[PDB]
Every structure is written in structure tokens, then in C-alpha cells.
Design a protein around this ligand. Structure first.
Ligand SMILES: Nc1ncnc2c1ncn2[C@@H]1O[C@H](CSCC[C@H](N)C(=O)O)[C@@H](O)[C@H]1O
Length: 249
DNA sequence: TTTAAAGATCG
DNA sequence: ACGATCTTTAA
């Protein structure tokens, strides 16, 4: 199982085996919520359509793809012992929020992801990254993970857009996998959760397969009722299980 | 300016 | 999911 170079929510590494089992074969893979791209990095499709609402995330991916060697040499210089302290971290975080250069922002973004608190990605209403210092012993520089991403990305297109627009890029030879933000166990609204299901039912009706992963709750059962859903027992957090909704035509 | 409740901030 | 301290919202 290949590892992503970013710390990110929805790593789904223990679920990668289960996703691949229920993921239909196809020419292209559409991923509306790509995030760290663990599925993209652990599958074998000829083409990829990868999208996310996070503009920093998509901008980083393009730069890693198009300017690989340049980016790696610049980002590696930030992973040295003297950058592992609060004062330097908050200046880098400020430099990121004031930078207008996509390349420089992409470099700092990896630093903030690996040195930041719990690898979180948080913004205020001004679009300013405000995650505090993480205080780790020795943050890992994912050089191998970076180069592997860049190679894999040669057959991929990245778009910063909502799920509705990205899924509309799907043709007959494409498969769609969806990993939306988790459903409430007790932001991404409930309407969007149900909307995603509606669009999914549209694609199948049109001969495009769709696979959706989420928690196993009462709401997810109802949203994904028109799909041959399967369950997997991760069983921890009450104990909650993961639901895999498959819209096979 | 008053005001009570809600939302936003960021370590 | 935390919390002291900001800003916001409406009459
Ligand atoms: N409305 C939207 N349209 C497209 N992408 C979205 C979106 N809302 C959130 N996303 C992206 O989708 C990704 C989901 S990763 C979330 C995985 C898992 N469900 C969890 O909640 O932990 C995030 O990186 C986020 O940037």
C-alpha cells in the first residue's frame, strides 16, 4: 500500500483493500474528493480526474506534477532541525498567508502540514491558515512519496471545484469513487450528502458506475438505498462501521 | 449606544 | 471535541 506525502483526513488505508474490491474496472477514475489521494496512489487506471474544493491542495498538486525536481529541492530545505520550533513555524505560517506566489505557497504548505498540529488544515473566514505548532520530535520529509506522486500524476488532471462539477466530467468509460466528509454520528451540510446520492443515481442511470464510502448510520442507509451497499467492521471511535455504496449499472 | 444569543478565533 | 475572547446579528 503506497503512502501519500500529505497528512490528511480520510486516509482510508485500512479500507483500501475493501474499496478496490468493490471498485469497477474502467478507463478513467473520477475522484471528486481526492484529498491526499490514497485511492489514486493505490489503484491502476489509465487516466485520472482528481478534484477537491481546497484550492491550496489542488495548486500544490499541479506544482508537484509540473515542477517536480524544482519543488523537492526547495521543500527539503525546510525540513531541517532549526525549523522545528514555534517562532520559525509561525513566521512560515505568516509568510504562507501573505505570499502571492503559488510555488512558494506550495513549498510552505508541505512544511505546515508536517510541522503543524495533528497535520490539520484549518482556515479562518479570511482564508488564512491558522493551525498552531505541532511540536513533533522529527517530522518526516516524504521525498519518495513526492516523486511517486509526480510519476503517477502524469496520467491525471486536477481541478479545484465542487463535487457537482467534477462528477459532470464523467463519461462512459470512467468510474467514480466518492469519499465525502463523514456523516454526523449524532461545513458539509446534510443536503449536500443527499445531493451526492442524487447525482450518483444520475450517473448510473446513464451507465456510469459510482462507488461511495461513508459511515454506517441510519442516514447513510437512506441516502444510498438505491445501491448494493456493503458494510465493513472497522468498529471503533459507540462503535461505527464503514458503509460502501455501489451504484453498478 | 443597548442587549442577549450566537458565531468566529486560534492556541 | 476544547475554551477564553473576540466579532456578529437582530430588534
Ligand atoms: N463540497 C465539496 N465539493 C468537493 N470537495 C469537497 C467538498 N467539501 C469538502 N471537499 C473535500 O473533500 C475532501 C474529503 S476528505 C474527507 C474524508 C472523510 N470522509 C472524513 O471526513 O474524514 C476534503 O479534502 C475536502 O477538501
Amino acid at each position: 500500500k503506497n503512502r501519500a506525502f500529505l497528512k490528511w483526513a480520510g486516509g482510508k488505508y485500512p479500507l483500501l483493500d475493501d474499496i478496490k474490491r468493490h471498485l469497477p474496472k474502467g478507463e478513467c477514475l473520477v475522484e471528486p474528493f481526492v484529498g491526499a489521494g490514497s485511492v489514486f496512489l493505490n489503484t491502476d487506471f489509465s487516466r485520472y480526474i482528481l478534484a477537491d474544493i481546497n484550492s491550496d491542495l489542488i495548486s500544490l498538486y499541479n506544482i508537484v506534477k509540473m515542477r517536480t525536481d524544482e519543488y523537492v529541492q526547495a521543500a527539503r530545505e525546510l525540513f531541517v532541525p532549526e525549523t522545528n520550533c514555534a517562532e520559525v513555524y509561525y513566521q512560515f505560517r505568516e509568510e504562507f498567508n501573505k505570499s502571492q506566489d503559488p510555488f512558494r505557497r506550495a513549498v510552505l504548505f508541505l512544511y505546515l502540514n508536517r510541522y503543524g498540529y495533528n497535520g490539520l488544515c484549518r482556515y479562518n473566514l479570511r482564508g488564512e491558515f491558522n493551525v498552531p505548532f505541532g511540536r513533533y520530535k522529527k517530522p518526516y520529509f516524504p521525498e519518495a512519496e513526492l516523486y511517486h506522486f509526480a510519476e503517477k500524476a502524469q496520467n491525471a488532471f486536477f481541478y479545484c471545484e465542487s463535487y457537482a462539477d467534477s462528477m459532470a466530467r464523467a463519461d462512459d468509460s470512467s468510474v467514480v469513487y466518492c469519499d465525502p466528509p463523514y456523516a454526523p454520528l449524532s461545513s458539509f451540510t446534510l443536503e449536500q450528502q443527499a445531493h451526492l446520492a442524487e447525482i450518483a443515481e444520475g450517473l448510473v442511470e446513464r451507465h456510469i458506475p459510482v462507488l461511495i464510502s461513508n459511515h454506517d448510520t441510519m442516514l447513510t442507509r437512506e441516502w444510498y438505498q438505491r445501491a448494493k451497499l456493503h458494510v465493513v467492521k472497522v468498529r471503533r471511535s459507540k462503535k461505527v462501521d464503514e458503509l460502501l455504496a455501489l451504484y453498478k449499472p
